[PDB]
Amino acid sequence: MMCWIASYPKAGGHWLRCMLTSYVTGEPVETWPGIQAGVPHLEGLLRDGEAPSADPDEQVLLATHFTADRPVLRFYRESTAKVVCLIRNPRDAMLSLMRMKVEACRKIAETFIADEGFSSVRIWAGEGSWPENIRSWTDSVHESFPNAAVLAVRYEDLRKDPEGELWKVVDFLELGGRDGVADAVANCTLERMREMEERSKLLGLETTSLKFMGDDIEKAYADLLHGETDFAHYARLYGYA
Amino acid sequence: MMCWIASYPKAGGHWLRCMLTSYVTGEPVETWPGIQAGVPHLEGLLRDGEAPSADPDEQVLLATHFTADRPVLRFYRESTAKVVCLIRNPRDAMLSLMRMKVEACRKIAETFIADEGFSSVRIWAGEGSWPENIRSWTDSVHESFPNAAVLAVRYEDLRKDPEGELWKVVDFLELGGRDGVADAVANCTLERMREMEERSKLLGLETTSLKFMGDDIEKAYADLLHGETDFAHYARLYGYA
């Protein structure tokens, strides 16, 4: 049975794949390759010319930023049982983009707001816009995975209660007991994460506030935000009003 | 029926895909996307979450640098009819790497010579070494494409006689008459190529001598070159002694 950790880029997917790994592993993990090993990232596999077998007879966890309707996923149409769809406040994704990427912002925000996401950003591909992505993995999901049940979780909820919010993913994914959760929440940390990334870069190895600028932007973001356009729909729904 | 233009990176694959396109197109092509359209590059498709259907009922041309044994190619096991395997003097691939990438060289050459290719180069993935790549697409080809016939062509031969050397690919690929060949050879040029690349970068759009350093390197390259190790085998065979 095939299981996706699906997410728009920068929705906190690394952080989540960290936790799911060190829970399944049991051991803490330091090396980032250790995470690609626990919850491999489809894009990465494909870049190597790997593609996981369709119809594994034991459970596999794969993570991706692809839209559920991407044709390369059609190989997994019948074998997909579960989807964990991880969601974040889109406003944060922008900051997360600058955070890693003031004239520079009041226009990327326009592109983002025109994009309704990161479509112009060459870093990722196949992700569509933020709402097209959420839809494909939630409400329109059976159009590309008809056997699948979905559990959505917000970055915002995982941060305010990491333990409980994780167990839900664990239990949903029927990965075992509620016991490992704390020690698994423990080794992944907005600090210990930053550290794990560091070691791995250094060894070589493969790796990885609004108005402070706005004023004029704000009136446009909030128009997108409260504006009967699928983005706003999904903002309304996952509490980003 | 599925057809590959297979090549080690920097074997002149863009140049060849240019020609095959403007022959099938008929029109000259300026824009690089125009080439991705004529002979799409599997890696690129996959980066978007596209994957061409297995068992097309009309002929498709796809280009790739993957080893023929990469698991993602297994979808094409039975539907592959033909392979054009494009080969270049490995020594040139090194220069081609520096050319786009003197302390800097006498060690990349060591890595290349230790690699027997570009395995350490993060630009490409899944290509294996130069001889593993050639083997997979030539002599060991039926291990991953059992219905396939193969025609090998050398960059070196395409440069000294572009017209005739192309017709052979055309005829082999049963793409039509010998007539378009010259006008198709014509629009692709070690100059007009450089120009096409330029326009496309500028518009935005997606795009792309030994001893002068050696002495000490030379004695190691030629040891690899005349040294009963599969590299030398394939050097012996395609005339790089």
Binding residues of A for substrate, as ranges, are 41-44, 124
Separation of alpha carbons B127 and B7, rounded Å: 9
User: Distance of alpha carbon B159 from its chain centroid, rounded?
Assistant: 14
Domain boundaries, chain A: 1-88+129-209, 89-128+210-241
Query: How far apart, in Å, are the Cα atoms of A195 and each of A25, A51, A181, A185, A192?
Result: 19, 30, 21, 15, 5
Residue of B nearest to A68 (CA): B49
Which residue do the tokens 């786009």 mark? B100
Burial class (CB in 10 A: 0-12, 13-18, 19+), A96: middle
Domains B1-88+129-209 and B89-128+210-241 share a fold: no
Closest of B158, B157, B137 to residue B149, by C-alpha? B137
| Residue among B179, B130, B132, B188 nearest B159 (CA) | B188
Tell me the torsion sign for CA atoms B81, B84, B90, B93. Answer: negative
Q: Is B206 helix (H, G, I), strand (E, B) or coil?
A: coil
Which of these, B75, B78, B71, B87, lies nearest to B135 by C-alpha position? B87
Name residues whose C-beta falls within 8 Å of residue B58's C-beta, 6 or more positions apart in sequence: B1
Residue type, B11: A
The answer to whether the beta carbons of residues B167 and B23 sit under 8 Å apart is no
Sequence-distant (6+) residues with CB within 8 A of A126 are A43, A65, A66, A67, A70, B47, B48, B49
Q: Which residue from A minimizes the CA distance to B122?
A: A206
CA angle B48, B50, B53 (to 5 degrees): 170
What backbone phi and psi angles, to 5 degrees, belong to B32?
Answer: -60, -45
For residues B44 and B103, the answer to whether their CB atoms sit within 8 Å is no
Q: Which of A41, A47, A121 to mutate to test the interface with B (most CBs of B within 10 A)?
A: A47
Report CA-CA distances (Å) from B23 to A142, B41, B171, B180: 42, 18, 12, 6
10 Å CB burial of residue B135 (0-12, 13-18, 19+) is buried
Q: Which of B162, B117, B150 is nearest to B8 (CA)?
A: B117
**CB–CB of B115/B219 below 8 Å?**
no
| Nearest partner of B11 among B137, B180, B122, judged by Cα | B137
Cβ atoms of A175 and A24 within 8 Å: the answer is yes
- Could you give the residue ranges of the DSSP H alpha helices within chain A? 13-25, 32-38, 42-48, 90-98, 108-115, 130-137, 155-160, 162-172, 181-187, 192-202, 218-225, 230-237
Pairwise CB contact (< 8 Å): B46 & A47:
yes
Residue A46: list chain B partners with CB under 8 A: 46-47, 72
* Residues forming a β-bridge with B151: B84
| Contact assessment for residue A109 and residue A121, using Cβ atoms and an 8 Å cutoff | no
Has B12 been labeled as part of a binding site? yes
Pairing of strands B60-64, B2-7: parallel
Are B176 and B170 contacting, i.e. CB atoms less than 8 angstroms apart?
A: yes
User: Cα(A80)–Cα(A98) distance, rounded to whole angstroms?
Assistant: 35
Third-level CATH fold of A89-128+210-241? 1.25.40
Beta bridge partners of A86: A7, A153
At how many degrees (to 10) do helices A108-115 and A218-225 cross?
10
Distance from CA of A38 to the nearest CA of B (A): 20
What does the alpha-carbon distance between residue A192 and residue A55 come to, in Å, rounded to a whole number? 35
> Where on the phi/psi map is residue B49: left (φ > 0), alpha (ψ -120 to 50), or beta?
left
Residue A89, class by beta-carbon neighbours within 10 Å (0-12 exposed, 13-18 middle, 19+ buried)? Answer: middle
Which H helix or E strand runs over B86?
A: strand B80-87
Count Cα atoms within 13 angstroms, Cβ side, for B141.
Answer: 19
Among chain B residues, CA nearest to A73: B49
CB contact set of A124 (below 8 Å; sequence gap of 6+): A9, A65, A118
Q: How many residues does chain B have?
A: 241
Q: Looking at CA atoms only, how far is residue B50 from chain A in angstroms?
A: 5
Biggest distance spanned by C-alpha atoms of chain B: 54
A229: left (phi over 0), alpha (psi -120 to 50) or beta: beta
In the Cβ-directed half-sphere of B67, how many Cα atoms lie within 13 Å?
Answer: 22
User: Please, which residues have CB within 8 angstroms of residue A216's CB and are 6 or more apart in sequence?
Assistant: A106
Length of chain A: 241
Specify the experimental method.
X-ray
**CA-angle at B48, arms to B44 and B53, nearest 5°:** 80
User: Which residue has tokens 């698994």?
Assistant: A184
For residue A128, the chain B residues in CB contact (below 8 A) are none
Resolution (A): 2.6
Partner residue facing A46 (CB), from B46, B67, B74? B46
B65 given a catalytic annotation? yes
Helix (H) / strand (E) containing A86: strand A80-87
Superfamily (CATH H level) for B1-88+129-209: P-loop containing nucleotide triphosphate hydrolases (3.40.50.300)
Q: Which residues partner with B4 through β-bridges?
A: B62, B83
Contacts of B43 in chain A (CB under 8 A): 47
Sign of CA dihedral B227, B228, B232, B238: positive
Dist. CA A157–CA B212, nearest whole Å: 61
CA–CA gap between residue B75 and residue A178 (Å, rounded): 40
